[PDB]
Amino acid sequence: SALGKLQDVVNQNAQALNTLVKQLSSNFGAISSVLNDILSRLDPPEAEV
């Protein structure tokens, strides 16, 4: 714990980055979070929505 200040900097950046990654799984109202599932199933007039 003696070096906790440096460990803290590392942990905060790691957490922020992992959060950015996890957000890719959110749907935000979409049928799927996966861009490829949208593209492989819908025609452009719907895929674009």
Partner 1 sequence: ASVYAWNRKRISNCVADYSVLYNSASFSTFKCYGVSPTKLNDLCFTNVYA
According to CB under 8 A, which one of 7, 17, 18, 41 is a site residue for partner 1?
Answer: 41
13 sits near partner 1 (criterion: CB under 8 A): no
The minimum distance between CB 44 and partner 1, in angstroms, equals 10
35 sits near partner 1 (criterion: CB under 8 A): no
43 sits near partner 1 (criterion: CB under 8 A): yes
> Cα separation of 47 and 49, whole Å?
5
The answer to whether residues 33 and 25 touch, using CB atoms and an 8 Å cutoff, is yes
> Cα separation of 45 and 22, whole Å?
28
Determine the distance from the C-alpha atom of residue 13 to the mean position of all C-alpha atoms in its chain, rounded to a whole number: 15
Instruction: Note the residues at the interface with partner 1 (CB under 8 A).
Output: 31, 40-43, 46
